[PDB]
Design a binder for this molecule. Structure first.
Ligand SMILES: Nc1nc2c(ncn2[C@@H]2O[C@H](COP(=O)(O)OP(=O)(O)NP(=O)(O)O)[C@@H](O)[C@H]2O)c(=O)[nH]1
Ligand SMILES: [Mg+2]
Length: 177
């Protein structure tokens, strides 16, 4: 019985909120309800012989909803990085999201911290960002795992979150100290 904090970072419009309500509640909606502030949802899951409670913190990509020195980050056990395959700008921002996270949570051993990158929205056909340069990018950065997901049609949502889970748990375990 173990608690995992998991934070979902990335630009506004990538579908951070939609991946959440899909994974947790198996529901999808077209209605873009801009995420004000930062809340969470819990999903209970089984990872490797162990019941895990995953607290999933969904944040506001916009700077329209920033207050104001967000230290909700720390105690994080896995940071999830979401870009939109139809928008090259949301992929370019990933380092900046990754840097910002590491400043804020500043976990010890920062470069073994579990990141997961989700190429959301592959249910569309106008993908701009190939699988190949995002596969590269996740590899350039300590070989972090990468899925191409769709919250709408629910492709790789479950699979990806099994990895989010398992990696969150390894990291939690690493607090032997
Ligand atoms: N076709 C399709 N639309 C998606 C997908 N994921 C999200 N959307 C749509 O994209 C828009 C933005 O989604 P949203 O979840 O709000 O993204 P967000 O990153 O959480 N935005 P915010 O940071 O402002 O909450 C919404 O219209 C949403 O329904 C997807 O996989 N496929
Ligand atoms: Mg959101």
């Amino acid at each position: 019985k173990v608690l995992l904090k998991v934070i979902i970072l990335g630009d506004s419009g990538v579908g951070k909120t939609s991946l959440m309500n899909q994974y947790v509640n198996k529901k999808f909606s077209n209605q873009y309800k801009a995420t004000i502030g930062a809340d969470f949802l819990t999903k209970e899951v089984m990872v490797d012989d162990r019941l895990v409670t995953m607290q999933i913190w969904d944040t506001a990509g916009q700077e329209r909803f920033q207050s104001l020195g967000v230290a909700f980050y720390r105690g994080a056990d896995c940071c999830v990085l979401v870009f939109d395959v139809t928008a090259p700008n949301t992929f370019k921002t990933l380092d900046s999201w990754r840097d910002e996270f590491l400043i804020q949570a500043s976990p010890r051993d920062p470069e073994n911290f579990p990141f997961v990158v989700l190429g959301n929205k592959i249910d569309f056909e106008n993908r701009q960002v190939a699988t190949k340069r995002a596969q590269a990018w996740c590899y350039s950065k300590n070989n972090i795992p990468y899925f191409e997901t769709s919250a709408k049609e629910a492709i790789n949502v479950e699979q990806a979150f099994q990895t989010i889970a398992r990696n969150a748990l390894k990291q939690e375990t690493e607090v032997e100290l």
